[PDB]
Structure formats: C-alpha cells, structure tokens
Design a binder for this molecule. Structure first.
Ligand code: HEM
Ligand SMILES: *[C@@H]1O[C@H](CO)[C@@H](O[C@@H]2O[C@H](CO)[C@@H](O)[C@H](O)[C@H]2NC(C)=O)[C@H](O)[C@H]1NC(C)=O
Ligand SMILES: *[C@@H]1O[C@H](CO)[C@@H](O)[C@H](O)[C@H]1NC(C)=O
Ligand SMILES: *[C@@H]1O[C@H](CO)[C@@H](O)[C@H](O)[C@H]1NC(C)=O
Ligand SMILES: [Ca+2]
Ligand SMILES: [Zn+2]
Length: 595
C-alpha cells in the first residue's frame, strides 16, 4: 500500500477520555480515531481529486492541456458572462432577513478555512504575483479576458495564491494534493474560541478568575463590550481608512473583520460568552475560571448547533431537509465528521445571498443619520464604522429589518463582491469573489458538475438540451455550453448555484444533497453534539430548547424590539415584539450542588 496516514504535522494526540469538554483543536472527539474532525488536517475527499497532472496542477494551469478535450474557460470570463448583473432592483429575498445570509457565513467560518499557503513571508511573489502576473508555484493568477473593463484600469490579472496543503507546503507529498482545514469540523463555536491553543489562550481574560473572554480596553459600545483589536501590522482595517486608524478585531477566527456584519455577529457571540460566564458565577460562586469558561463555551456551542439545525438548515434545504438530515438518533462513531473539500465550495451558495448595501437603522427602525445605507464594498475590513459610527446596534437592526439577496439565474453575485472585493495586502477594491471561487474550485482539484450530479444520484446532462432541462433555463445553459463546451467541465461552484432552488429552500438539488450529507455527518459524527445523551442533563436540554437569535439580541445589545422568527423577512413594527415576551435561557439547571 501507500501512506495510510501522512500526519507528521500536529502528531500530539494527548486525550483525556473522561473530560466533559471539547478540546480547542477538535482532537479526541472520536475515541477510535482521535484526529477525526481536528483542525490543521486535510479536508476529506468524498471523491478523488481531479488535477491536470493527476497530482497537484489545477485544470487551466497548462494552456495546451484540456479537460475532456476542451480548454477550461477563464474564471473571470465565466464571472463576467454569467455571474454579473447591473440592476439591483427586484433582487431581494421577500422571505429571508439579512440575518439569514449572515448566519450562513458564521456557520461556514465555524466549519472550514483553507488559508492561502505561507510562501509570501519576506517574498517577491507576494507583490510579484500581483505586479507581473507570472504563474508559478503558489502564484495562480486570475487572468482577465480581452474585453474585460478591468484590463483597462487594473493591469493583466487579479493575484491569486494556491491554498495550503498537508505534509508541508513547498515540497511534494503522497499522491494527490490535499488542502488543509485550519478550523474544527465540529459545529463548536471555534470561530469565537479559536481552533489553536495559542490563539484560544490570547482571547481569554486570565487576569480575573471569571472565565471571561478579553474585551476591547480602548473603546466601548455605550458601555457594552467590543472584541479586542488585533495589534499586528499591516492591518487591512487600518489601510481602508488611515485617518480613523481603527484596527481589525481579534476573534476565534482570522476572518472576523472581512465585513462589518460578520464583525457584528462575532461581537454578539463574545458578549454572550461573557454574559453566560457571569450568570454561572452567580449560580456557582465555587466554580473557578476554567470551569466557568468551559461551561459558557459548551453552552455557546449548543446555541450555535440549535439555531443552525433547528432554524437555519430547514429554510436552506426545504423539502430536502428530511431526506438528508433525519431526526437525531444519537452519536454514531462510525460517521466521518470531517468537512469535505467539496462542502467548502457548496456552502459558497451564500455569495449569491449578499445584497449590494448595508443599513444602520435607529430605535424606530428608521434610517440612522444622513448616510444610513452604505455600499457593501465600503464595509470590507471596516471596524471604524462600528467604533466611530454608533456601535453594532444600528447594524443589528439592519440584520433584522433588511432582506437577504435572492439567488437569481440572471443576477447571481452583486458587483460589490464581483468587481469591488478588497483583499488584504492588495490595496484596491477591485477583486472578484466569483472568479476567486472558480479559480479555487480548480486549485482544490474539484471534480466537475456531472461527477457531483452522479455522486448525488442525479442526471448527468451531456448536451445543450439536457442542460437546459436541468437548469430550466435555455439562455443560462447556452452561456455555460459556450464557455465550458461540455457540462462535465462546469466548475461545481457555478454548476450547483445555477440549479433552480428546491421547494421551501434556497439551494438546488445538487447543493441540497452535498450540504445535507455534510450537516448529517457533522451532527451524527459529533461525540459532544448538544442532544447526545450525557453531554447535557435532560433539564439543561429542556432550557437549551428555548434559545433564539431574538433572545441573543435582547441579552447582548440595547435593542428592545425583535421578531420571533429572525431569519424570516420581518417588517417593523408589525413583526416585532418587546424582548419581555421572548423566552430566556434558564440557567438554573446548571446550579451545581455538592452540599
Ligand atoms: C459580504 C459577505 C461575504 C464576503 C465578503 C465573503 C468573502 C469571502 C472570501 C474572500 C472568501 C475566500 C475565497 C477564496 O479565497 O477562495 C470566502 C470564502 C467562503 N465563503 Fe464567503 N463571503 C461572504 C459571505 C458568505 C456567506 C454568506 C457564506 C455562506 C452562507 C459564505 C461562505 C463561504 C465559504 C464556505 C467559503 C470557503 C471557506 C474556506 O473553507 O476557506 N460566505 N468568502
Ligand atoms: C475615515 O474615518 C473618519 C473618522 O470617522 C471619517 O470621518 C467622519 O467624517 C465625516 C465627514 O464626511 C464627519 O461628518 C464625521 O462626523 C467624521 N467623524 C470624525 C470623528 O472625524 C471619514 O469619513 C473616513 N474616511 C473614509 C474615506 O472612509
Ligand atoms: C479582565 O476582567 C477583569 C475583571 O472584570 C476586567 O476588569 C479587565 O478589564 C479584563 N481585561 C480584559 C483585557 O478584558
Ligand atoms: C452509522 O454510520 C454508518 C456509516 O455511515 C452507517 O452505515 C450506519 O447505518 C450508521 N448507524 C446507524 C444506527 O445509523
Ligand atoms: Ca468548528
Ligand atoms: Zn445604548
């Protein structure tokens, strides 16, 4: 045989079989295979990787080398011809709040992160990849097609660095290249606590014995906590306004400041940890700092699991929810809890749910000041609009009262992401998330659309007429055939997102299958699943059943009017109630009696 386990990186398996709490790394969840679901290991392969050279080089790397007899089209040309639209009118989701989009990004960041390889440390190809657009090693530039307006204003290419891969990065490995998942595959609030012991300790307040997370000591939100600043340079949150000089936040996850509403959600979860820890200290004054942090951490993880599986997944998967995620039947230690490489592209359906603007709303849910509504691109790596523009509350009102973008076959990704994305160290609001997604599919050796259709037991269209029937769209099928030539070559991100949405859902059949299977595994394969008998007492579970995003807002802001169903499209004041009428989390079942 060949390498049965290339695990030279992170070989430390020191598991306490008795511990009632998760590790920060995800190790020790599975007793028989303790690294399963742990951070800093390979993404799972549900199907074999598909590279140009069978091992590592992406389809599209070598100009002459076809996929199935056809050249793969430029990611940016696919973005321009299929993904782009001008008219934002009529694009909003009449039955999903903006919080529906934002929760999807939060869950995705809990589950997976494939960071760009670190060969840019005091390196030219950091700026040389950008400067000279020369493909090589980890530089895999997104080249502009001839008619691209960006060819006129931005040079020959958008820089793009190949994702990190296991059995270290600069040299070869054991058959095909496997990209890393840098976070824990468990739905475990790793995005609040970190997936690495160093970060996890840095985020804690070890000054007091109260099991608190560290909070900003330079700025307060009407006496409510902010995340600490990340005091490291260069900072993209500083770069986007050098007058305000407000740094990025430091959170459990590297990406927390990518946009202002992610930073907002991260702020609510930090507040909630410190709140739970304070309540537990009252009930159990005998509890030390560690105990308080672990018990609060375990409650926040449960909160995230319930909102996700009870409130969010049903209104993503629609009719397909029951097919893929049956009612829970307990922990199955034969289930692979690892996030799959393909899932990390399937969950990018959220890119098509991001609308072009973000609003700040006042306490009457009316525009907050003269520039209440802002273009999303001005809010990438933007903490100063929080610190110096009325805190998170007006943004949280926006999350409740404003709508997600609806996916549309003729209006896929707003230009705010498709033409104006800002990437750290790159200096301009000029990148294309759609093109990045297609290039990344190829970077990760993704099987094409029809391989995934076959994996999901769905038809594999071979012709224009077959693709028209699957997509229920003749113009969309024609553009995809003109670019790809055969449906076998369609990159999974665009092919899954092109399918019309399932009844009561927000993704098509192929994505429902891939997402559904992944979520089934992360629940069934988790020893610490909130509803796994023994994790919580039956009384704790009866209290946990009452959590809501609504209560989270009431407890962790100066917002007093909230909807009951925060992911539905809700209009003020008709759909809003006082916080008074909203179920609280009763922590009394956490009262710990030895005497
Ligand atoms: C304004 C909102 C958002 C921004 C600016 C944004 C930005 C990004 C960027 C720059 C990447 C990395 C692309 C790459 O290098 O390959 C990314 C990845 C991703 N995004 Fe988004 N995104 C947004 C919203 C969302 C939403 C709403 C979802 C899900 C519902 C989502 C899910 C993902 C996932 C799953 C990944 C891959 C994570 C990994 O394994 O590395 N994003 N996003
Ligand atoms: C950079 O951030 C500064 C600091 O907030 C912004 O300035 C505010 O600017 C407007 C003028 O357009 C004033 O009405 C506010 O009252 C200002 N507040 C303070 C404390 O200066 C500035 O707009 C930002 N610039 C950019 C390009 O984002
Ligand atoms: C740590 O907690 C103490 C106790 O409340 C608090 O006064 C102090 O500011 C905190 N330090 C940080 C960095 O959060
Ligand atoms: C446990 O998971 C395995 C592999 O996925 C599956 O075959 C088996 O049916 C599962 N056990 C139960 C009781 O569902
Ligand atoms: Ca996690
Ligand atoms: Zn206030």
């Amino acid at each position: 045989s060949w390498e049965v386990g290339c695990g030279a990186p992170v070989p430390l398996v020191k598991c306490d079989e008795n511990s009632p709490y998760r590790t920060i790394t995800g190790d020790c969840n599975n007793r028989r295979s303790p690294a399963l679901g742990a951070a800093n290991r390979a993404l799972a392969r549900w199907l074999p990787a598909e590279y140009e050279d069978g091992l590592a080089l992406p389809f599209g790397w070598t100009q002459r080398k076809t996929r199935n007899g056809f050249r793969v089209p430029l990611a940016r040309e696919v973005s321009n011809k299929i993904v782009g639209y001008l008219d934002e009118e009529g694009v909003l989701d009449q039955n999903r709040s903006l919080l529906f989009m934002q929760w999807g990004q939060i869950v995705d960041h809990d589950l997976d992160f494939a960071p760009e390889t670190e060969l840019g440390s005091n390196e030219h190809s950091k700026t040389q990849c950008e400067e000279y657009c020369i493909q090589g090693d980890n530089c895999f530039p997104i080249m502009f097609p001839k008619n691209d307006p960006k060819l006129k204003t931005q040079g020959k290419c958008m820089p793009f660095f190949r994702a990190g891969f296991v059995c270290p990065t600069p040299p070869y490995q054991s058959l095909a290249r496997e990209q890393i998942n840098a976070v824990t595959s468990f739905l475990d609030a790793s995005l609040v606590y970190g997936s690495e012991p160093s970060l996890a300790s840095r985020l804690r307040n070890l000054s007091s014995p109260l099991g608190l997370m560290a909070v900003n000591q330079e700025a307060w939100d009407h006496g409510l906590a902010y995340l600490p600043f990340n005091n490291k340079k260069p900072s993209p949150c500083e770069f986007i306004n050098t007058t305000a000089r407000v740094p990025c936040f430091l959170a459990g996850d590297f990406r927390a400041s990518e946009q202002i509403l992610l930073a907002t959600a991260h702020t609510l979860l930090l507040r909630e940890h410190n709140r739970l820890a304070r309540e537990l200290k009252k009930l159990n004054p005998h509890w030390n700092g560690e105990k308080l942090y672990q018990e609060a951490r375990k409650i926040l993880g449960a909160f995230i699991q319930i909102i996700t599986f009870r409130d969010y997944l049903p209104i993503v998967l629609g009719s397909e929810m029951q097919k893929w995620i049956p009612p829970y039947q307990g922990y199955n230690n034969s289930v692979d809890p690892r996030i799959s490489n393909v899932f990390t592209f399937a969950f990018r359906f959220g890119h098509m749910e991001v609308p072009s603007t973000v609003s700040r709303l006042d306490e009457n849910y009316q525009p907050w000041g003269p520039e209440a509504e802002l273009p999303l691109h001005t809010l990438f790596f933007n903490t100063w609009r929080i610190i110096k523009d009325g805190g998170i509350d007006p943004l949280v009102r926006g999350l409740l009262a404003k709508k997600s973008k609806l996916m549309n076959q003729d209006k896929m990704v707003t230009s705010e992401l498709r033409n104006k994305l800002f990437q750290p160290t790159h200096k301009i609001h000029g990148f294309d998330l759609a093109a990045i997604n297609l290039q990344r599919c190829r970077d990760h050796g993704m099987p094409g659309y029809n391989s995934w259709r076959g994996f999901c037991g769905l038809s594999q269209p071979k012709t224009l007429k077959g693709l028209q029937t699957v997509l229920k769209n003749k113009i969309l099928a024609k553009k995809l055939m003109d670019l790809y030539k055969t449906p076998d070559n369609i990159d999974i991100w665009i092919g899954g997102n092109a399918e019309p949405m399932v009844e009561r859902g927000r993704v098509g059949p192929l994505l429902a299958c891939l997402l559904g299977r992944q979520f089934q595994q992360i629940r069934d394969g988790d020893r610490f699943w909130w509803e796994n008998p023994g994790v919580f007492t039956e009384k704790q579970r009866d209290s946990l059943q009452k959590v809501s995003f609504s209560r989270l807002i009431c407890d962790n802001t100066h917002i007093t009017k909230v909807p009951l169903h925060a992911f539905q499209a809700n209009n003020y004041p008709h759909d809003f109630v006082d916080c008074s009428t909203v179920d609280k989390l009763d922590l009394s079942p956490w009262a710990s009696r030895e005497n």
